[PDB]
Design a protein around this ligand. Structure first.
Ligand SMILES: [Cl-]
Ligand SMILES: [Cl-]
Lengths: 187, 187
């Protein structure tokens, strides 16, 4: 049975942080659903790349639950995720079932907004640190990828491969991650 | 006057190799046109990410010429680029005007197909080397990014940031590339 990933795509998401994990997870044989926060219509990302989601979030939620829920960054994408009652419900359900939650760059600030994973060690983009740390509800890390309790976080576009391969290792194991990694020509 | 980039997007293109250069070039203030080989309609990439191009290639060609023409990889994307008379005409015009041509992963095999840049030092994805080298028309390199004459090449998804920043440096200079690079959290 293949593992399943939900990637929540909002207006202003960082397109690299969306596409790198989608693609790498699919390389790992993970069934990935790219779900549009706002509906089924195409999504204008932070640098104007337009991505057509596989489904609305409304519809994707009905086919849950998922082995991982993935929150890309992009400041305005993260803010949209943070404002969504639907996202809150998805993340709470995922936390309650002890499922993996993964977030990158400004993405982890939606965890704060939704009161998810408090007490965990987390990283973010450096410019998102102060936001994430408001109230001291997490312990901050400068690791390029951090993983504590249910919560897997990472820092930026340049850490997206490392983040995606961490998700792969958590779901499908270290051997699959290594096999996926080799053809990518990573440094 | 901002520099201008044409990124040619074909069915089966590697989505990471498409989105990383688009996004990084836009960060550098380059005006990027994502042009659909087949028309204006959305493009299904190699790992099923669907990207809506800015324009058809037909239309984008009319607004040329461009400071760089960019060929993503993906085997089936590259094959589609290699079969296109429109791409051939674009690359020949770009070569004739001594403009930059950039290609990544299997992308450089379209240069071979279209008889572009013979005699140049080039790199490709390792699995695309034998294709690229058929006839010995180029000199092969294992550098992660290679640049010789008009021709800038690179190896894979994992070299895409390095490739994009090389394009940025060629167009906008080393200082802009360094400024763009810092917030990406590259290794
Ligand atoms: Cl952003
Ligand atoms: Cl491919």
């Amino acid at each position: 049975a293949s593992k399943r990933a939900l990637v929540i795509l909002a207006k202003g998401a960082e397109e690299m942080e969306t596409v790198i994990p989608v693609d790498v997870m699919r390389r790992a044989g993970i069934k990935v659903t790219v779900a549009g926060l706002a509906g089924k219509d195409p999504v204008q990302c932070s640098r104007d790349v337009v991505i057509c989601p596989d489904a609305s979030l409304e519809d994707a939620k009905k086919e849950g639950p998922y082995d991982v829920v993935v929150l890309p960054g992009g400041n305005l994408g993260a803010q949209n995720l943070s404002e969504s009652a639907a996202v809150k419900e998805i993340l709470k359900e995922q936390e309650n079932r002890k499922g993996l939650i993964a977030a990158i760059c400004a993405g982890p600030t939606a965890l704060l907004a939704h009161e998810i994973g408090f007490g965990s060690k987390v990283t973010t983009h450096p410019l998102a640190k102060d936001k994430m740390m408001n109230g001291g509800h997490y312990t901050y890390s400068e690791n390029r990828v951090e993983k504590d309790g249910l919560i897997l976080t990472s820092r930026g576009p340049g850490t997206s491969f490392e983040f995606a391969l961490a998700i792969v290792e958590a779901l499908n194991g270290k051997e699959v991650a290594a096999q996926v990694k080799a053809p990518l020509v990573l440094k």
